[PDB]
Amino acid sequence: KQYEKSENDLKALQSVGQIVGEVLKQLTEEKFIVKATNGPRYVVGCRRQL
Amino acid sequence: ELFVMAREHAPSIIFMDEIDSIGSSRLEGGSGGDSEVQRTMLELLNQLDGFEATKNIK
Amino acid sequence: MQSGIIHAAEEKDWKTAYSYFYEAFEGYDSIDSPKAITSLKYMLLCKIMLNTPEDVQALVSGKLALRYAGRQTEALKCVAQASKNRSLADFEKALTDYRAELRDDPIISTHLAKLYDNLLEQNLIRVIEPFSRVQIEHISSLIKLSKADVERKLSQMIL
Amino acid sequence: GGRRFSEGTSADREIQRTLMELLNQMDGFDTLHRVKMIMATNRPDTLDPAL
Amino acid sequence: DQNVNVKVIMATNRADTLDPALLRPGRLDRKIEFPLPDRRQKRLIFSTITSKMNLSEEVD
Amino acid sequence: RELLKPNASVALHKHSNALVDVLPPEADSSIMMLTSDQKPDVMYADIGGMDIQKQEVREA
Amino acid sequence: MAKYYTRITMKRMAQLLDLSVDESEAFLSNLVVNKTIFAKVDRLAGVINFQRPKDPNNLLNDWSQKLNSLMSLVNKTTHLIAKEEMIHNLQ
Numbered sequence: 001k002q003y004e005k006s007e008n009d010l011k012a013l014q015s016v017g018q019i020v021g022e023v024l025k026q027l028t029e030e031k032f033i034v035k036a037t038n039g040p041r042y043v044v045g046c047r048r049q050l
Numbered sequence: 051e052l053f054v055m056a057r058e059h060a061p062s063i064i065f066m067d068e069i070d071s072i073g074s075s076r077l078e079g080g081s082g083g084d085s086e087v088q089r090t091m092l093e094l095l096n097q098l099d100g101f102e103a104t105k106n107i108k
Numbered sequence: 109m110q111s112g113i114i115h116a117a118e119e120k121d122w123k124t125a126y127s128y129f130y131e132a133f134e135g136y137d138s139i140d141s142p143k144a145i146t147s148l149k150y151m152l153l154c155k156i157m158l159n160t161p162e163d164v165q166a167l168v169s170g171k172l173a174l175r176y177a178g179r180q181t182e183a184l185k186c187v188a189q190a191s192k193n194r195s196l197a198d199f200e201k202a203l204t205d206y207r208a209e210l211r212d213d214p215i216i217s218t219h220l221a222k223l224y225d226n227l228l229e230q231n232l233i234r235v236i237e238p239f240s241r242v243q244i245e246h247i248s249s250l251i252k253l254s255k256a257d258v259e260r261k262l263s264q265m266i267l
Numbered sequence: 268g269g270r271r272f273s274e275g276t277s278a279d280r281e282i283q284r285t286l287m288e289l290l291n292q293m294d295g296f297d298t299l300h301r302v303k304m305i306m307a308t309n310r311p312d313t314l315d316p317a318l
Numbered sequence: 319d320q321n322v323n324v325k326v327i328m329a330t331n332r333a334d335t336l337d338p339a340l341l342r343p344g345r346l347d348r349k350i351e352f353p354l355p356d357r358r359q360k361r362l363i364f365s366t367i368t369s370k371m372n373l374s375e376e377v378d
Numbered sequence: 379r380e381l382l383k384p385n386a387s388v389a390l391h392k393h394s395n396a397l398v399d400v401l402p403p404e405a406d407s408s409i410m411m412l413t414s415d416q417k418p419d420v421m422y423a424d425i426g427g428m429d430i431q432k433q434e435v436r437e438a
Numbered sequence: 439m440a441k442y443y444t445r446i447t448m449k450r451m452a453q454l455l456d457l458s459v460d461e462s463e464a465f466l467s468n469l470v471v472n473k474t475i476f477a478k479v480d481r482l483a484g485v486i487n488f489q490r491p492k493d494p495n496n497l498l499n500d501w502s503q504k505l506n507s508l509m510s511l512v513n514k515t516t517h518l519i520a521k522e523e524m525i526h527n528l529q
Contacts, residue, residue, distance in 0.1 A: 025405050033387070033405045041406065043389050071338045075274060084338070111429070121423040127365045128426065238470030240478035240487065271332055297416040317331060327438065350434050359427025366426045 053095065056107045063108050109136075109147050116154070117215055126154040137171055145176040146213050152184035157219060161192040180209050183216075191223065194231065195252035196261075199224050228261065268314040286315055293318065440475045440488045448483045459483070 021034040024041065035041050056062035070082030080086035096102055112128035115121045129151045136144035148169070155164040165188065173181045183206050190198035203210075203220065210217040231251045235242060248255045268289055269282040291297050292304065308314065319325040330336060368377065386403035390396070422432075439446075439454065452459045466479050466486075478487045490496075522528065 022408075025407055027402070027405060031401075033401075035408065043401065067342070069338045069342060071336070071341050073274070074334065111426070115423075119422075123369055124366055124423045124426060127362075127369045131361070131365065234471075238467050238477060238479055239481060241480035241482045241484065243481040246481065271334060294418065296412055296418065298419060301416075324438070348438070350438065352428075352431055352434075354428065356427075356430075359429065362426030362429070366424055370424050 053091075053098075053107060061106050061108075109143065109150075112150065113213075113215055116150075116157075117218055122154050122157050126151065129154065133169065133172065140175065144172050145180060148172045148176065149180065149184060149209075149213065149216060152188075153215060153219065156184065156188050156191060156223070159191065161188040164188040179205065180212075183209055187220065187223070191227070193252070194227065196224070196228055196231065197252050199227060200253075228265070232262075232265075268308075268318060270315060286318070290315070290317055440477060444488060444490060446486050446488075448480070448486055451486060 019036050019038055021036045021042075021044075024033045024035050026032050029046055032044050032046060033041060034044050052064070056064065066084065066088055068082050068084045068088060070077070070085055072083040073079070076083035076086070080089060082088075095105070095107075101107070109129065109132035112125040112132070115128065116125035129147060132147045133151060136147050151169065152164055152167065155161075155167060164185065168185075183202070186202045187199065190202065203224065206220075210220065228251070232247075235247050235250050239246070244255050244259075247258050251258055253261075268286050270286075271283050272279040273283065289306075292302070293299070382397075382400060384403075387401040387405040389398045389401060391398060439451075446454070448459050448462065451462050455462055463479060463481070466477055469475070470477050470479075475488065478490075480486065
């Protein structure tokens with residue numbers, strides 16, 4: 001039980017606390033404009049699994 | 051501040067239009083918020099440095 | 109009366125137009141003028157426009173209508189009858205006599221053209237839709253015209 | 268909810284702005300049907316003449 | 319301004335709403351005034367709105 | 379690089395330092411809009427009144 | 439019936455329904471209005487056409503679709519074939 005918990009815990013440890021944002025305008029699927037919570041607005045992509 | 055910037059990139063003509071539609075307690079300070087500013091600017095600038103008979107930022 | 113014409117023909121607000129025409133009618137009853145009869149047309153006209161022909165029949169206000177009775181009063185009812193029947197022919201006949209009335213006020217001319225044309229269009233859509241190579245007798249019969257008359261009018265429509 | 272004010276503190280510009288929102292929601296492009304509001308107020312002469 | 323779009327439309331409910339930079343003669347060519355008390359309008363508002371919702375037989 | 383110069387949104391790299399592409403001035407907008415949603419309890423048709431005013435709005 | 443047969447004569451349809459040509463015509467008039475399936479029916483008696491526009495466009499798109507699937511099929515089948523081919527382990 002602890003093995004599963006720790007293995008899943010390593011995957012949490014390598015993984016950061018990723019930037020949360022909001023969609024300012026979706027131009028198309030491949031270019032989305034976001035307002036990131038760190039400050040600077042970014043152009044981001046999307047994964048196809050969404 | 052306005053004089054130093056104007057002086058740096060000189061000459062300048064500072065066109066102060068004193069419509070004086072500001073306040074209701076700035077019209078008891080000089081009869082315009084802008085007119086209070088203009089009195090400050092006028093008296094100071096006349097006298098300032100050599101800029102009275104070397105004045106060129108009107 | 110006049111605010112109603114602009115609303116009805118140009119801006120297409122029949123509701124606001126109806127309401128205008130009522131107020132106008134009330135004011136007209138004291139006098140006799142050509143203006144008074146133009147008010148009578150319009151109230152009836154709004155109903156026909158709605159495409160309920162029953163309302164037209166329910167509504168009739170005889171107060172200005174009887175004075176002026178002749179061709180102008182009857183026209184609004186005949187047009188309604190025609191819409192109800194789904195006959196192009198009733199509409200077709202009526203229109204020729206009526207052309208002086210069409211010239212007199214703009215509102216009637218334009219809306220009657222919409223109605224005639226609309227009616228032809230309704231009748232035709234149902235006739236084509238399940239039959240390709242449909243018989244001439246069948247279009248003559250649904251529209252309610254003679255065989256020669258429908259083909260002629262159709263020629264224009266194809267174009 | 269207040270008024271225009273704003274020949275004073277940074278609080279004064281802030282009340283007029285917040286007031287703008289209450290106006291829209293009541294009716295000014297958004298109409299009450301999806302959300303409904305009852306406002307409990309101490310002094311009704313504080314609010315806007317519009318409100 | 320002078321675009322396919324409507325130019326900025328503004329409303330003010332006070333004489334202290336405005337700013338002299340906005341106010342300046344040489345910015346406003348147009349002045350839209352607005353009355354509202356007239357006897358005519360009152361009848362017109364009532365009949366159109368009454369007509370919007372359903373008609374009764376006690377309609378006057 | 380001739381459609382580069384207007385003031386509009388654009389993309390730059392953090393540290394691969396290139397103006398990689400250009401983007402429409404449309405992008406960058408956090409403002410919402412209701413074209414006619416949560417519809418006001420008025421219309422031009424649902425009044426008849428403010429006739430004198432009906433010319434002043436129509437034009438503007 | 440309408441979905442399978444692109445084309446039937448009016449006459450053949452009567453034999454199929456076991457109702458006369460005139461009765462079938464009236465049924466189709468009602469059917470097309472409900473819009474359960476589109477039909478074109480003639481009073482001439484020539485043909486009843488179901489799902490045909492009479493454009494070359496239909497034939498051009500249809501023609502392409504059959505060829506497009508086929509290529510995909512050959513490449514997948516051979517992967518399994520490779521296993522059979524080895525022999526002396528099945529037999």
